[PDB]
Backbone as JSON, one array per atom type, in Angstrom:
{
  "sequence": "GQRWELALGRFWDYLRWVQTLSEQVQEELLSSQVTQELRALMDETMKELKAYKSELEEQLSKELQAAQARLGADMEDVCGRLVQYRGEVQAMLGQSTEELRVRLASHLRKLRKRLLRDADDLQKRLAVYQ",
  "N": [[-50.69, -75.61, 16.04], [-48.7, -72.74, 15.3], [-48.27, -71.02, 12.08], [-45.38, -71.35, 11.46], [-44.52, -73.74, 12.61], [-46.07, -75.47, 11.22], [-44.97, -75.14, 8.72], [-42.45, -76.11, 9.31], [-43.04, -78.63, 9.8], [-43.64, -79.43, 7.34], [-41.19, -79.48, 6.01], [-40.1, -81.41, 7.38], [-41.65, -83.69, 6.53], [-40.82, -83.94, 3.88], [-38.09, -84.51, 4.28], [-38.07, -86.83, 5.77], [-38.8, -88.48, 3.69], [-36.67, -88.23, 1.74], [-34.41, -89.2, 3.3], [-34.77, -91.97, 3.08], [-33.49, -92.57, 0.78], [-34.1, -94.02, -1.59], [-33.94, -95.38, -5.08], [-35.56, -93.59, -6.4], [-35.45, -91.33, -4.92], [-32.94, -90.66, -5.28], [-32.83, -90.28, -8.03], [-34.31, -87.69, -8.4], [-32.73, -86.4, -6.84], [-30.34, -86.02, -7.97], [-31.11, -84.53, -10.14], [-31.86, -82.5, -9.1], [-34.31, -81.6, -7.85], [-35.26, -82.4, -5.53], [-33.45, -80.84, -3.83], [-34.18, -78.32, -4.59], [-36.84, -78.16, -3.89], [-36.44, -78.54, -1.19], [-35.03, -76.37, -0.28], [-37.12, -74.5, -0.74], [-39.0, -74.96, 1.06], [-37.6, -74.67, 3.61], [-37.22, -72.14, 3.39], [-39.88, -70.98, 3.59], [-40.31, -71.69, 5.91], [-38.69, -70.23, 7.52], [-39.86, -67.53, 6.88], [-42.49, -67.35, 8.03], [-41.51, -67.74, 10.43], [-39.79, -65.65, 11.03], [-41.69, -63.68, 10.8], [-43.4, -64.22, 12.96], [-41.73, -63.9, 15.23], [-41.05, -61.27, 14.87], [-43.45, -60.0, 14.94], [-44.0, -60.53, 17.42], [-42.73, -59.04, 18.88], [-43.68, -56.39, 18.38], [-45.66, -56.72, 20.09], [-33.02, -61.45, 26.44], [-33.84, -61.14, 23.61], [-31.76, -61.94, 22.29], [-30.79, -64.6, 22.58], [-33.19, -65.91, 21.82], [-33.02, -65.3, 19.16], [-30.69, -66.57, 18.81], [-31.33, -68.91, 18.92], [-32.95, -69.15, 16.79], [-31.31, -68.83, 14.66], [-30.23, -71.24, 14.77], [-32.05, -73.24, 14.04], [-32.04, -72.6, 11.73], [-29.58, -72.94, 10.55], [-29.45, -75.9, 10.97], [-31.41, -76.64, 8.96], [-30.23, -75.47, 6.64], [-28.12, -77.0, 6.74], [-28.92, -79.79, 5.98], [-29.76, -79.38, 3.43], [-27.3, -78.35, 2.2], [-25.98, -80.68, 2.48], [-27.24, -82.47, 0.88], [-26.84, -81.38, -1.42], [-24.22, -81.73, -1.74], [-23.45, -84.5, -2.02], [-24.83, -84.89, -4.49], [-23.01, -83.44, -5.85], [-20.68, -84.89, -5.47], [-21.27, -87.3, -6.84], [-21.84, -86.91, -9.61], [-19.16, -86.84, -10.27], [-17.81, -89.04, -10.08], [-18.05, -91.04, -11.95], [-20.0, -93.19, -12.51], [-19.11, -95.19, -10.48], [-19.73, -97.46, -7.59], [-22.06, -95.94, -5.28], [-22.75, -96.71, -2.79], [-21.26, -96.47, -0.27], [-21.09, -93.74, 0.06], [-23.56, -92.93, 0.42], [-24.3, -94.26, 2.63], [-23.0, -92.74, 4.29], [-24.25, -90.39, 3.85], [-26.79, -90.79, 4.86], [-26.25, -91.22, 7.5], [-25.27, -88.95, 8.4], [-27.5, -87.64, 7.85], [-29.55, -88.55, 9.77], [-28.5, -87.49, 12.11], [-28.87, -84.96, 11.86], [-31.45, -84.64, 12.14], [-31.85, -85.37, 14.82], [-31.26, -82.99, 15.77], [-32.74, -80.98, 14.63], [-35.19, -81.6, 15.96], [-34.5, -81.16, 18.78], [-33.51, -78.37, 18.63], [-35.67, -76.96, 17.86], [-37.66, -77.53, 19.42], [-36.68, -76.35, 21.49], [-36.47, -73.78, 20.36], [-39.23, -73.28, 20.29], [-40.18, -73.27, 23.17], [-38.67, -71.04, 24.02], [-40.08, -69.01, 22.26], [-42.56, -68.98, 23.45], [-42.1, -68.05, 26.21], [-41.32, -65.66, 25.76], [-43.62, -64.37, 24.73]],
  "CA": [[-49.38, -75.04, 15.94], [-48.54, -71.52, 14.31], [-47.76, -71.05, 10.8], [-43.95, -71.8, 11.42], [-44.41, -75.2, 12.93], [-46.77, -76.18, 10.22], [-44.1, -74.89, 7.8], [-41.44, -76.87, 9.56], [-43.5, -80.04, 9.65], [-43.57, -79.93, 5.85], [-39.85, -79.61, 5.62], [-39.83, -82.64, 8.11], [-42.29, -84.66, 5.84], [-40.05, -84.11, 2.83], [-36.84, -84.87, 4.62], [-38.25, -88.23, 6.02], [-38.77, -89.16, 2.5], [-35.26, -88.15, 1.32], [-33.73, -90.2, 3.97], [-34.92, -93.4, 2.58], [-32.54, -92.64, -0.31], [-34.51, -94.98, -2.65], [-33.42, -94.91, -6.22], [-36.43, -92.57, -6.84], [-35.07, -90.02, -4.31], [-31.78, -90.45, -5.92], [-33.05, -89.68, -9.32], [-34.67, -86.39, -8.28], [-31.47, -85.9, -6.07], [-29.29, -85.62, -9.08], [-31.63, -83.65, -11.19], [-31.87, -81.41, -8.09], [-35.59, -81.24, -7.67], [-35.14, -82.53, -4.15], [-32.67, -79.66, -3.32], [-34.99, -77.19, -4.89], [-38.06, -78.16, -3.0], [-36.03, -78.62, 0.25], [-34.71, -74.84, -0.01], [-38.41, -73.67, -0.71], [-39.6, -75.4, 2.29], [-36.95, -74.24, 4.7], [-37.43, -70.65, 3.28], [-41.2, -70.65, 4.03], [-40.32, -71.85, 7.42], [-38.06, -68.89, 8.1], [-40.62, -66.41, 6.94], [-43.48, -67.57, 8.94], [-41.08, -67.58, 11.91], [-39.32, -64.28, 10.98], [-42.93, -62.95, 10.85], [-43.76, -64.56, 14.25], [-40.87, -63.32, 16.15], [-41.18, -59.89, 14.75], [-44.74, -59.59, 15.45], [-44.25, -60.91, 19.06], [-42.06, -57.89, 19.33], [-44.71, -55.34, 18.4], [-46.41, -57.28, 21.22], [-33.92, -62.3, 25.78], [-34.06, -61.2, 22.18], [-30.57, -62.43, 21.61], [-30.9, -65.95, 22.8], [-34.23, -66.11, 20.9], [-32.35, -65.22, 17.84], [-29.45, -67.52, 18.7], [-32.13, -70.32, 18.83], [-33.49, -69.14, 15.53], [-30.14, -68.95, 13.81], [-29.84, -72.65, 15.02], [-32.93, -74.15, 13.32], [-31.71, -71.98, 10.34], [-28.35, -73.81, 10.33], [-29.96, -77.1, 10.77], [-32.0, -76.77, 7.59], [-29.25, -75.15, 5.67], [-27.29, -78.26, 6.69], [-29.39, -80.88, 5.29], [-29.73, -78.96, 1.81], [-26.06, -78.44, 1.95], [-25.54, -82.04, 2.57], [-27.65, -83.29, -0.25], [-26.04, -80.76, -2.72], [-22.75, -82.14, -1.78], [-23.61, -85.66, -2.55], [-25.11, -84.73, -5.81], [-21.59, -83.03, -6.32], [-19.68, -86.07, -5.41], [-21.77, -88.33, -7.75], [-21.64, -86.72, -11.06], [-17.81, -86.68, -10.57], [-17.27, -90.36, -9.75], [-18.1, -91.9, -13.18], [-20.76, -94.4, -12.11], [-18.72, -96.35, -9.6], [-20.6, -97.42, -6.57], [-22.19, -94.97, -4.46], [-23.29, -97.1, -1.53], [-20.61, -95.88, 1.02], [-21.28, -92.3, 0.06], [-25.01, -92.91, 0.78], [-24.39, -94.94, 3.92], [-22.51, -91.66, 5.23], [-25.18, -89.32, 3.74], [-27.98, -91.15, 5.76], [-25.73, -91.18, 8.84], [-25.21, -87.46, 8.66], [-28.92, -87.1, 7.87], [-30.13, -88.92, 10.95], [-27.81, -86.68, 13.06], [-29.26, -83.55, 11.88], [-32.87, -84.93, 12.46], [-31.98, -85.29, 16.24], [-31.0, -81.63, 16.11], [-34.01, -80.2, 14.2], [-35.96, -82.01, 16.99], [-34.35, -80.22, 20.0], [-33.34, -76.92, 18.46], [-36.81, -76.37, 17.52], [-38.19, -77.92, 20.56], [-36.06, -75.25, 22.22], [-36.98, -72.64, 19.91], [-40.7, -73.2, 20.63], [-40.43, -72.66, 24.58], [-38.06, -69.67, 23.85], [-41.08, -68.15, 21.82], [-43.61, -69.01, 24.46], [-41.87, -67.25, 27.4], [-41.23, -64.29, 25.3], [-44.99, -63.74, 24.53]],
  "C": [[-49.32, -73.81, 14.89], [-47.82, -71.89, 12.96], [-46.34, -71.54, 10.56], [-43.8, -73.18, 11.72], [-44.94, -75.9, 11.74], [-45.75, -76.15, 9.06], [-42.97, -76.0, 8.07], [-41.75, -78.35, 9.56], [-43.52, -80.5, 8.21], [-42.34, -80.22, 5.44], [-39.55, -81.27, 6.29], [-40.46, -83.89, 7.15], [-41.42, -84.9, 4.46], [-38.59, -84.83, 3.07], [-36.95, -86.38, 4.93], [-38.12, -89.04, 4.85], [-37.33, -89.22, 1.74], [-34.46, -89.27, 1.83], [-33.61, -91.58, 3.39], [-33.92, -93.66, 1.38], [-32.83, -93.87, -1.29], [-34.2, -94.38, -4.03], [-34.34, -93.72, -6.86], [-36.04, -91.22, -6.28], [-33.74, -89.7, -4.91], [-31.82, -89.82, -7.42], [-33.49, -88.01, -9.27], [-33.58, -85.62, -7.49], [-30.54, -85.37, -6.82], [-29.9, -84.66, -10.09], [-31.83, -82.19, -10.27], [-33.2, -80.71, -7.75], [-35.64, -81.42, -6.17], [-34.47, -81.3, -3.45], [-33.59, -78.36, -3.42], [-36.15, -76.98, -4.02], [-37.56, -78.01, -1.42], [-35.69, -77.06, 0.59], [-36.19, -74.1, 0.03], [-39.07, -73.82, 0.59], [-38.9, -74.83, 3.51], [-37.2, -72.72, 4.71], [-38.79, -70.23, 3.78], [-41.15, -70.83, 5.59], [-39.72, -70.75, 8.16], [-38.86, -67.72, 7.99], [-41.67, -66.45, 8.14], [-43.0, -67.48, 10.3], [-40.67, -66.05, 11.89], [-40.39, -63.3, 11.37], [-43.57, -63.07, 12.36], [-43.1, -63.79, 15.27], [-40.91, -61.68, 16.03], [-42.35, -59.31, 15.2], [-44.97, -59.93, 16.84], [-43.59, -59.66, 19.62], [-43.08, -56.66, 19.48], [-45.59, -55.59, 19.53], [-47.86, -57.87, 20.97], [-34.27, -62.2, 24.41], [-32.92, -61.59, 21.53], [-30.74, -64.11, 21.48], [-31.97, -66.43, 21.85], [-33.51, -66.32, 19.6], [-31.04, -66.04, 17.81], [-30.08, -68.86, 18.48], [-32.84, -70.37, 17.44], [-32.5, -69.27, 14.47], [-29.62, -70.44, 13.94], [-30.81, -73.45, 14.18], [-32.56, -73.72, 11.83], [-30.62, -73.03, 9.75], [-28.81, -75.18, 10.09], [-30.6, -77.54, 9.48], [-31.09, -76.58, 6.57], [-28.16, -76.26, 5.6], [-27.63, -79.36, 5.94], [-29.35, -80.58, 3.62], [-28.22, -79.12, 1.42], [-25.27, -79.62, 1.78], [-25.88, -82.81, 1.39], [-27.02, -82.65, -1.46], [-24.72, -81.15, -2.79], [-22.73, -83.54, -2.35], [-23.76, -85.62, -4.07], [-23.74, -84.38, -6.45], [-20.7, -84.19, -6.6], [-20.1, -87.27, -6.46], [-21.48, -88.09, -9.17], [-20.12, -86.47, -11.44], [-17.03, -88.0, -10.47], [-17.39, -91.35, -11.03], [-18.81, -93.26, -12.87], [-20.17, -95.48, -11.4], [-19.67, -96.42, -8.42], [-20.6, -96.37, -5.62], [-22.84, -95.31, -3.01], [-22.59, -96.67, -0.19], [-21.02, -94.41, 1.04], [-22.76, -92.1, 0.63], [-25.14, -93.5, 2.24], [-23.94, -93.55, 4.96], [-23.57, -90.5, 4.92], [-26.34, -89.55, 4.78], [-27.52, -91.11, 7.08], [-26.01, -89.74, 9.34], [-26.68, -86.94, 8.78], [-29.68, -87.41, 9.16], [-29.68, -88.05, 12.13], [-28.44, -85.35, 12.97], [-30.71, -83.55, 12.22], [-32.85, -84.82, 14.09], [-31.75, -83.8, 16.63], [-32.23, -80.71, 15.69], [-35.02, -80.36, 15.41], [-35.71, -81.08, 18.18], [-34.01, -78.9, 19.82], [-34.56, -76.04, 18.21], [-37.77, -76.45, 18.85], [-37.82, -76.66, 21.72], [-36.58, -73.99, 21.76], [-38.29, -72.23, 20.13], [-40.98, -72.69, 22.11], [-39.78, -71.19, 24.73], [-39.01, -68.66, 23.08], [-42.42, -67.98, 22.74], [-43.45, -68.19, 25.77], [-41.84, -65.86, 26.87], [-42.55, -63.63, 25.11], [-45.39, -62.88, 25.65]]
}
């Protein structure tokens, strides 16, 4: 798999871990190491892609780009969702976070179904373009 899928698979690896929302994920989630690494992995994912699409140009370009702006949104979504939780926690004064995490994890499962297909789609859309 080209540089971009390898990049996306690393994002997938870290997300799968976040999802478990174990106290350890929660620790680094509120320190925001989780969000910092999530954004570094998403960005490396968009370069290797940005570079792939551009270089597939040098040797249909709207949808491609409509499909790229999709996987983008999907990743920006996860990070934006994790950074929101962090926000809602340091403002609740230590009262229970279980319902906020039941919601975060549902939302997170939902974005996973999208990363799956929007990329599965982005892929066939890069193959035909070639």
